[PDB]
Amino acid sequence: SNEDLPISMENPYKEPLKKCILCGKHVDYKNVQLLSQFVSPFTGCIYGRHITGLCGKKQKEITKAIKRAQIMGFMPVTYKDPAYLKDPKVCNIRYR
């Protein structure tokens, strides 16, 4: 009929979802070097999702991994282990 009729199609300009830094990467309860990144250096308190910038699934996975490591003796409970202080800062925190 008329070739200029707008067509029914999905958005091509839509951008892919912002994958969380851990999305598609398997969290493990033995990767203390990783879990340390998501706990408070001075107290060992687990950072909330509003600080870790992680989706619900991976936030829960990190929480469970941290608890499992702590109870099984892989991770200190009351502090980020000093060996991992130089690791990249992946939590939006402004102590200083």
Binding site: D4, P6, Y13
Partner: protein
């Protein structure tokens, strides 16, 4: 052989431009208030930029300027609002004077 409205929309430069995020356009100053420059850029709304600290005097009515558009219309939904509130002005970054 008169182009239809659909054809005009299809071939409109504004349609040609995709999403208006970070796009570069050549806007035009059309109203200046002290340090506020009201720049129209062919869109529905205008952007209210501020006079850059460098070459401020060069910014005068009718001056063609470069803009990085962030949003054609500044709108948002507030708590419990039944419709989006719009501030009736685009959001763009003044990159300087086009020559």
């Amino acid at each position: 052989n008169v182009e239809s409205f659909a054809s005009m929309l299809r071939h409109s430069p504004l349609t040609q431009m995709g999403p208006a995020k970070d796009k570069l356009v050549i806007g035009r100053i059309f109203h200046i208030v002290e340090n506020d420059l009201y720049i129209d850029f062919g869109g529905k709304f205008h952007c209210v930029c501020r006079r850059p600290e460098v070459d401020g005097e060069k910014y005068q009515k009718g001056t063609r300027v470069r803009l990085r558009l962030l949003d054609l219309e500044l709108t948002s939904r507030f708590l419990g609002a039944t419709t989006d509130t719009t501030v009736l002005e685009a959001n763009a970054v003044l990159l300087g004077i086009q020559e």
